[PDB]
């Protein structure tokens, strides 16, 4: 079977402008494992991105965490670009500090 | 510690 | 309370690109403690938690040998499943393995686990008596016959009842500071005005462990499951978890809505309102 990933883009700690933080993009519940995940700053692919080791839930659906150290500003906009086989086109999730 | 099949 | 040890395994064949990709992780409760990736130049099982780093060379040597050994069996097994299902070599397939044990407060084995999935679906699973198998189809039933003849269930039962539980209790003890201790969620309720007439209420649980938590919204003591946006529990990135529950309410009627938070770290369930 094939399942489409669920996508969450959030911060490790509460958004504080001008303070070092972590930008997280959590992709979960997808199958197969092959997935493409990108962090975006102002529409530019973030360069230093790390990810968790591949794991899966009780239902064999996979989950990954892509993270990067970032410093939130008021002007700068952040997003997560995920590409999967279950997606006709790469899905983009904008980052909301309130979520 | 892991298990390994025979 | 009760604690669990789990090892997760995934092999995915890569037609044309090369040999199958193998990745495995180890979890004690909700704490990742080991990992192996076949994509590494000189792959080895590496420590992802502090309390596992104590183990000596023979441990990391034996573990790495096991991980390399499992990857190779996964190749053999992937090829076999091709012939079972009469599938093409051109297609990429996934094989997934999980085995573990659950213990109680007394350090006694509650149950033992060993499951295998092919292309994301259940293939064959070891039953709770640790002496029987559940097969998904005629292909898994073929495997069931082989494994019964090879006494794989008796192999696993010995490990699950013995070496699994012992080492789990060891890990639990070695990292008792972090493992046994439960972090309560930092909780607050936020207010988000959608329109002049409507606002959104979001209930937050941050930095808690383990992942097991319950967030609910109530309208006048009544439950709002239908109209609650409940996101999946997410890792904060520091071995802790985050989760929020949101409801939309009419402006000026926030006092009608309460957020109820139930976690292990909390002495008693919490009730929150926007302030
Ligand atoms: N679920 C598994 N990976 N089983 C191992 C392969 C079993 C198969 N019947 C032979 O080889």
Residue C25: which CATH number? 3.30.500.10
Clarify whether residues C149 and C259 are in a common domain. no
Residue C143 CA to residue C80 CA, distance in Å, equals 10
DSSP C51: G
Please count the residues of chain C.
275
Residue C149 CA to residue C143 CA, distance in Å, equals 10
Clarify whether residues C47 and C26 are in a common domain. yes
Residue A64 CA to residue A26 CA, distance in Å, equals 6
Domain count, chain A: 1
Residue C173 CA to residue C222 CA, distance in Å, equals 43
Clarify whether residues C105 and C12 are in a common domain. yes
Chain A positions with Cβ closer than 8 Å to C: 1-3, 6, 8, 10, 12-14, 22, 24, 26, 28-29, 31-34, 52-56, 60-62, 65, 67, 98-99
Residue C6 near residue A50 (C-beta atoms within 8 A):
no
Residue A40 near residue A11 (C-beta atoms within 8 A):
no
Which domain covers residue C237, as residue numbers? 182-275
Clarify whether residues C137 and C39 are in a common domain. yes
Tally B–C CB contacts below 8 A. 28
DSSP C209: B
Q: What is the DSSP code string of chain A?
A: --BPPEEEEEESS---TTS-EEEEEEEEEEBSS-EEEEEEETTEE-SS-EEPPPEE-TTS-EEEEEEEEE---SS--EEEEEEETT-SS-EEEE--TT-
- Helical H segments across chain C, by residue range: 57-85, 138-149, 152-159, 165-174, 176-179
Clarify whether residues C93 and C17 are in a common domain. yes
Instruction: Among C166, C181, C196, give the residue marking a domain's end.
Output: C181
Instruction: Among C158, C181, C204, give the residue marking a domain's end.
Output: C181
Contact B1/C59, CB-based, under 8 Å? yes
Q: Which residues contact C213 (CB under 8 A, 6 or more apart)?
A: C185, C205, C233, C241, C243, C261, C262, C263
Contact A60/C96, CB-based, under 8 Å? yes
Q: Which residues contact C140 (CB under 8 A, 6 or more apart)?
A: C123, C124
Residue C46 CA to residue C75 CA, distance in Å, equals 22
- Token pair of C42 as six digits: 């000189």
Determination approach: X-ray
- Token pair of C15 as six digits: 């037609």
3+ Cβ–Cβ pairs closer than 8 Å linking A and B: no
Residues of chain C with C-beta less than 8 angstroms from the C-beta of B6: 150, 152, 155
φ and ψ of C101, to 5 deg: -140, 150
Let me know the angle formed at the C-alpha of C68 by A33 and C23, rounded to the nearest 5 degrees.
15
Residue C159 CA to residue C7 CA, distance in Å, equals 13
Which domain covers residue A78, as residue numbers? 1-99
Residue C215 CA to residue C217 CA, distance in Å, equals 7
Clarify whether residues C133 and C222 are in a common domain. no
| Chain C interface test: which of A3, A54, A65 (most C C-beta within 10 Å) | A54
φ and ψ of C15, to 5 deg: -50, 120
Contact A22/C237, CB-based, under 8 Å? yes
Domain count, chain C: 2
The CA-atom distances, in angstroms, between C216 and each of A25, C99, C205, C229, C246 are: 24, 33, 11, 10, 9
Contact B1/C150, CB-based, under 8 Å? no
Nearest to C273 by CA among C203, C216, C225: C203
Resolution (A): 2.2
Clarify whether residues C162 and C260 are in a common domain. no
Clarify whether residues C152 and C221 are in a common domain. no
C79 Ramachandran zone, left/alpha/beta (phi>0; psi -120 to 50) = alpha
Clarify whether residues C68 and C119 are in a common domain. yes
Clarify whether residues C146 and C271 are in a common domain. no
Clarify whether residues C127 and C186 are in a common domain. no
Clarify whether residues C237 and C196 are in a common domain. yes
Residue C211 CA to residue C234 CA, distance in Å, equals 8
Strand A44-45, strand A35-41: pairing: antiparallel
How large is the C-alpha radius of gyration of chain A?
14
Residue C215 CA to residue C125 CA, distance in Å, equals 32
């Amino acid at each position: 079977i094939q399942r489409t990933p669920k996508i969450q883009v959030y911060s490790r700690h509460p958004a504080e402008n001008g303070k070092s933080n972590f930008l997280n993009c959590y992709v979960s519940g997808f199958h197969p494992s092959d997935i493409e995940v990108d962090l975006l700053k102002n529409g530019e692919r973030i360069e230093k991105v790390e990810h968790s080791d591949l794991s899966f839930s009780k239902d064999w659906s996979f989950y990954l965490l892509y993270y990067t150290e970032f410093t939130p500003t008021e002007k700068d906009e952040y997003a997560c670009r995920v590409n999967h086989v279950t997606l006709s086109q790469p899905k983009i999730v904008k980052w909301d500090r309130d979520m | 510690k892991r298990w390994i099949i025979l | 309370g009760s604690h669990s040890m789990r090892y997760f395994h995934t092999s995915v064949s890569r037609p044309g690109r090369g040999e199958p990709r193998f990745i495995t992780v180890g979890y004690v409760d909700d704490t990742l403690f080991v990992r192996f990736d076949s994509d590494a130049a000189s792959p080895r099982e590496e420590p992802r938690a502090p309390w596992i780093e104590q183990e000596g060379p023979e441990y990391w040597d034996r573990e790495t040998q096991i991980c390399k050994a499992k990857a190779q069996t996964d190749r053999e097994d992937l090829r076999t499943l091709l012939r079972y299902y009469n599938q093409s070599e051109a297609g990429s397939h996934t094989l997934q393995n999980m085995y573990g044990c659950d213990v109680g407060p007394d350090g006694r084995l509650l149950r033992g686990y060993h499951q295998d999935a092919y292309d994301g679906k259940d293939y064959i699973a070891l039953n709770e008596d640790l002496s029987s198998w559940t097969a998904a189809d005629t292909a898994a039933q073929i495997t069931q016959r082989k494994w019964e003849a090879a006494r794989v269930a008796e192999q696993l039962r010995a490990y699950l009842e013995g070496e699994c539980v012992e080492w789990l209790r060891r890990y639990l003890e070695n990292g008792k500071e972090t493992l046994q201790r439960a972090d309560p969620p930092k909780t607050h309720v936020t207010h988000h005005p959608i329109s002049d007439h409507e606002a959104t209420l979001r209930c937050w649980a941050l930095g808690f462990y383990p992942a097991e938590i319950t967030l609910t919204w109530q309208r006048d003591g009544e439950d709002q499951t239908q109209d609650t946006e409940l996101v999946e529990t997410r890792p904060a990135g520091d071995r802790t978890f985050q989760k929020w529950a949101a409801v939309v309410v009419p402006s000026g009627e926030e006092q009608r809505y309460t957020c109820h938070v139930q976690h292990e770290g909390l002495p008693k369930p919490l009730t929150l309102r926007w302030e």
